[PDB]
Design a protein around this ligand. Structure first.
Ligand SMILES: CC(=O)N[C@@H]1[C@@H](O)[C@H](O)[C@@H](CO)O[C@H]1O
Ligand SMILES: *[C@@H]1O[C@H](CO)[C@@H](O)[C@H](O)[C@H]1NC(C)=O
Ligand SMILES: *[C@@H]1O[C@H](CO)[C@@H](O)[C@H](O)[C@H]1NC(C)=O
Lengths: 107, 37, 228, 230, 225
């Protein structure tokens, strides 16, 4: 259970990529934005071709088996992308998260 | 006897499929993703 | 060198409300001076014909014709004929098309299965299935309407009628809608509306909500003790 | 006259160890000396078939031409051709079977939906639906088991693999199984077992019964003892 | 001398599905030689009314003529004139009637309200009430189906559309269905179908059943000891 909250800055032009651990056994690896009001977790990026409706076409998945870092990148920032993005595995999304971190706008 | 499934363990079974006359009883997976072939 | 006939399907009668049957021309030379008409049993004239097609690579011509008729004149049973007289076909040929025989009409039964609970764990997208079983004849129409405004036709996919195994020649066909997983945990209703030519008022509708698969009661019992 | 070109289903290549290929003729006249031959893309001939079938009651003949090939040849994408020559047609008709490579392999997801609540009110029949989504390519094998034994295809009907709305090339398929209403209320657990290439084990399954699919009773009798203990 | 024009009613357009418009000729002196007909905007001819009425008992020579028309005609609003011929009439009298456009169509909002607990406790009958509300204009049609089969009109009662109290120009209606106590306690969804011309598909329906509420009823029964 890792909690590496980083302060990577963002903007419209700006791009921030998160780093995540991979089991490398070709399971379901996902990044999920937790919703405070909902109390559940909503997958923003998954192993399959699913992408969140708000994040359609502005996100990229980048997997290296060589270096054991699982990383996802966001092309543009609307400044609303401030929340607990947690990575993970297994079919489940909520109860399967491995590491969580909250990104940030401006700085 | 247990209630739950160990996430790092694999549980499987023999499923009796046929496809016609022959019956290749093949090992299925009751827990896809905790173990791979 | 033939002329075929295409009637408006019941999925178009229910949708267009402006019934229009056409006749298409297969393998005739791309020349002008063609005869086009729609004659019913008594043979009286109909609405004018427009929308002449263009040239084709295989040197064919399709002189089609769109006309406006009553939806109930077909119910009256008007034997319709599309007469075509081309230069390469000096002898005119007659066509035949109408509302056909009375089949044993049965009723559609729409059941509406919500997405599985274990599907609602990976949080990608739910899938609601509107199953229309046990109808006859074919040509059923299905569409979706969340709240009250018909979903855009590329979100849902409808299959084709297929015969039912445990029944005589009565089909079964059902289609699904792939909703977002963050929309099926709000309340967000999804009605499914079906039109078949054997229904009382020609339309049936069903609706599954989030608060439909919840259990009626819990029966927990804690028996905390201290023995073994 | 009609001639078919049926590629070998995965349920054949993986189960029968007989990854052959057959081309069937129909809609022709009842005649003999039909020259139906399988060839590779180089023009060379391969092994022939046997046990010519019998005609249909529809006063139309039916015959099949079969050729046995190895699996690695199939997984390479070779263009095999079945040619039919007969007196009816002055030009022999050719049909091509191959494997278009360059398609991704996705693992099917199996969802077992029990019959709806209002369907278990007429007390006439119950329909359980096995839905396989996301699998690519098509031609997946699905069947049903009732208390650990399979059923004939006379009680369950599967659907052809249709494309998916939001997916580029992924598909989906439905398999409905209809049973008597009282055959589902007393228990009698049903299982849907599927077998698509992409599965890591090539075979998976799901299961439902009356106490699992959308239950109306969480009958719990949990007991906890020896709280202090050692 | 009077000619009322009874228009095709939306409660008959949806029920009969054989749209016809009536030319009720009233208060003529008792005579003979009457040939009444209809014309379209094109002086359209119409099939003669079947079983045309004779001179009235009241001495009013009342002639009722019903002419079949295509539905599109009525919805289009194409006008129709009923030629009326009497021995008394030198010129055929004309009854020009057209469906009138110009009224905003607001969709109905059926809400089915379930039988009240008190009625149920007495155990004699239940009234389940559709409340089609918000509809505009009037002439809404309401009926009840159970197991997909419509019920007899003598079992449910539908009220007339009264104007909405607080909202602007709009109407509301009611429909009570009386059922036995045991029939509502075993299932029997009693779908309430409302047909109105402002609906997207002209047909809606809602369902209320013995289990259409009553949320999770827990039963924690701890025996800690
Ligand atoms: C099942 C139900 O609706 N209510 C039950 C009741 O029948 C039972 O007697 C009681 C004892 O714990 O628990 C509760
Ligand atoms: C609820 O649980 C109790 C014991 O915990 C049991 O006696 C009772 O039968 C249960 N109710 C149902 C409907 O099974
Ligand atoms: C509920 O569980 C109890 C405890 O074993 C059992 O006796 C009872 O039969 C169960 N109820 C039902 C309806 O199966």
């Amino acid at each position: 259970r890792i909690l590496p909250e980083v302060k990577v800055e963002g903007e419209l032009g700006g791009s921030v990529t998160i780093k995540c651990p991979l089991p490398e056994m070709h399971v379901r690896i996902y990044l999920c934005r937790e919703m405070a009001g909902s109390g559940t977790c909503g997958t923003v990026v998954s192993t399959t071709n699913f992408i969140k409706a708000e994040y359609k076409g502005r996100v990229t998945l980048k997997q290296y088996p060589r270096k054991n870092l699982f990383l996802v990148e966001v092309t543009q920032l609307t400044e609303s992308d401030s929340g607990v993005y947690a990575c993970g595995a297994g079919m489940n999304t909520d109860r399967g998260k491995t590491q969580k971190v909250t990104l940030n706008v401006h700085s | 006897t247990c209630y739950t499934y160990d996430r790092n363990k694999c549980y499987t079974a023999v499923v009796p499929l046929v496809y016609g006359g022959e019956t290749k009883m093949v090992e299925t997976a009751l827990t896809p993703d905790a173990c791979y072939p | 060198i033939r002329v075929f006939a295409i009637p408006p399907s019941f999925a178009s009668i229910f949708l267009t409300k402006s019934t229009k049957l056409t006749c298409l021309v297969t393998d005739l030379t791309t020349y002008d001076s063609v005869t086009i008409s729609w004659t019913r049993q008594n043979g009286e004239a109909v609405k004018t014909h427009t929308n002449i097609s263009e040239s084709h690579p295989n040197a064919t011509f399709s002189a089609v014709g769109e006309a406006s008729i009553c939806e109930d004149d077909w119910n009256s049973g008007e034997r319709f004929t599309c007469t075509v007289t081309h230069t390469d076909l000096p002898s005119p040929l007659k066509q035949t098309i109408s509302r056909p025989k009375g089949v044993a009409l049965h009723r559609p039964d729409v059941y509406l299965l919500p997405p599985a609970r274990e599907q609602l764990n990976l949080r990608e997208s739910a899938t609601i299935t509107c199953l229309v079983t046990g109808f006859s004849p074919a040509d059923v129409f299905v569409q979706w309407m969340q709240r009250g405004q018909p979903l855009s036709p590329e979100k849902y996919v409808t299959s084709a009628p297929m015969p039912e195994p445990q029944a005589p020649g009565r089909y079964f066909a059902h289609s699904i809608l792939t909703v977002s997983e963050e929309e099926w945990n709000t309340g967000e209703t999804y009605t499914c509306v079906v039109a078949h030519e054997a229904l009382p008022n020609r339309v049936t509708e069903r609706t599954v909500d989030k608060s439909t698969g919840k259990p009626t009661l819990y029966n927990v019992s804690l028996v905390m003790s201290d023995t073994a």
